[PDB]
């Protein structure tokens, strides 16, 4: 109760712990047959990797991002949130 | 009544993880539908004068 808090949306660091756990999700699930990633150090070279590529089902399930030991996650419950600035309704979770 | 959308299916895609094209298998045979909810938009302005 009575906690106001300057939240932020564009400088979060749960986002980077999602973008590198979905990159790691699509590397064990969608294995392409031919993959032309560049690898160079003006003129550059492009590599080509090849893995065993079968077809598998792919339906995304909900993923909860829990907090480790020693921290807690706030929750901006203001139902008209601008995304940034102060958020007057704040709960822990 | 409803609007149609002339979609496609690709096999040579630019993946979003890094830079560099992927290349995938031929598509599956039968019917593959997917019902989903468009709960969002990502627009972008164009500020002239």
């Amino acid at each position, epitope marked *: 109760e009575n906690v106001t808090e300057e939240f932020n949306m564009w400088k979060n660091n749960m986002v980077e712990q999602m973008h590198t756990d979905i990159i790691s999700l699509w590397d064990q699930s969608l294995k392409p*047959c*031919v993959k*032309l990633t560049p690898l160079c150090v003006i003129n550059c070279n492009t590599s*080509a990797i*090849t*893995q*065993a*590529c079968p077809k598998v089902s792919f339906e995304p399930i909900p993923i909860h991002y829990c907090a480790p030991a020693g921290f807690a996650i706030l929750k901006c419950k203001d139902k008209k949130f601008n995304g940034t600035g102060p958020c007057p309704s704040v709960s822990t979770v | 009544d409803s609007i149609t959308l002339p979609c*496609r299916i*690709k*096999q*040579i895609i630019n993946m979003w993880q890094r830079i560099g*094209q992927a*290349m995938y*298998a*031929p598509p599956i045979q039968g019917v593959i539908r997917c019902v989903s909810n468009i709960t969002g938009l990502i627009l972008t302005r164009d500020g002239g004068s």
Partner: antibody, heavy 132, light 110 residues
Framework: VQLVQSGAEVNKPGSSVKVSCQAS????????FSWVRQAPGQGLEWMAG????????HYAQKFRGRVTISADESTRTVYLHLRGLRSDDTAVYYC???????????????????????????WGQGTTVTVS | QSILTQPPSVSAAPGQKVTISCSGS????????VSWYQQFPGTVPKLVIY???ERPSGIPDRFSGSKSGTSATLGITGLQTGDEADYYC???????????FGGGSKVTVL
């Protein structure tokens, strides 16, 4: 990269042939196999050929109908079957693939019924066939 | 049969310059990539020049060529005994809807 075949075989007019060409990589989909012959005394002739990444298959003008060609997905091999074995077919059979990775650098959508057989590199050891 | 009109056999002195002039139509040279293959009689054939000017690993730079309109040439410098092989002219032709090889050109040295 290795590309091995089966051994030499003898045939009879009216029978068929089951010659294989088994790969060395992880799968077949990164390579575009072909099937060329070499009649003795003359050059070579492109008989058939398969591209598994698009599911297509291509043939010459003459060898349509007599030749069916199937690439087995599991053990990384491609077969070559032929019926109507006449005495002109007494030759050595060669399987040769190349890299399919150049089709991706084409702009947007490509020809998926078309053919990209060029610059074969991994020519197999050659299976000599004869009919009697 | 040679849809690409390749010469049957050429001959020159060892170390000199000889050019195989494989010509074709406008449906296999001007709008298709050509390639060449080298096979000693009794050996497995192998390419020597691809993409009209390129040499793979294991191929000397003495082999070259061109793709001029409806014709495709070979710049073959430095002839020795160990190039006693038949050279072919293979490319895709969409009009026949198949790959077509040339007539084969056998070089020989003294």
């Amino acid at each position: 990269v290795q590309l091995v075949q089966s051994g030499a075989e003898v045939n009879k007019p009216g029978s068929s042939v089951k010659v294989s060409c088994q790969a060395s990589g992880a799968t077949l989909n990164s390579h575009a196999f072909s099937w060329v012959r070499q009649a003795p005394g003359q050059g070579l002739e492109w008989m058939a050929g398969i591209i598994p990444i698009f599911g297509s298959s291509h043939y010459a003008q003459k060898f349509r109908g007599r030749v069916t060609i199937s690439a087995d997905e599991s053990t990384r091999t491609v077969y070559l079957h032929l019926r109507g074995l006449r005495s002109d077919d007494t030759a050595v059979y060669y399987c040769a693939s190349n890299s399919i990775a150049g089709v991706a650098a084409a702009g947007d959508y490509a020809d998926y019924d078309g053919g990209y057989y060029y610059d074969m590199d991994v020519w197999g050891q050659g299976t000599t066939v004869t009919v009697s | 049969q040679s849809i690409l009109t390749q010469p049957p056999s050429v001959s020159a002195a060892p170390g000199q310059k000889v050019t195989i002039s494989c010509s074709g139509s406008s449906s296999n040279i001007g709008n298709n990539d050509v390639s060449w293959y080298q096979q000693f009689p009794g050996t497995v054939p192998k390419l020597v020049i691809y993409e009209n000017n390129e040499r793979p690993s294991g191929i000397p730079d003495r082999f070259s060529g061109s793709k001029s309109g409806t014709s495709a040439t070979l710049g073959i410098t430095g002839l020795q005994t160990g190039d006693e092989a038949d050279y072919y002219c293979g490319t895709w032709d969409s009009s026949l809807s198949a790959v077509v090889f040339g007539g084969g050109s056998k070089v020989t040295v003294l």
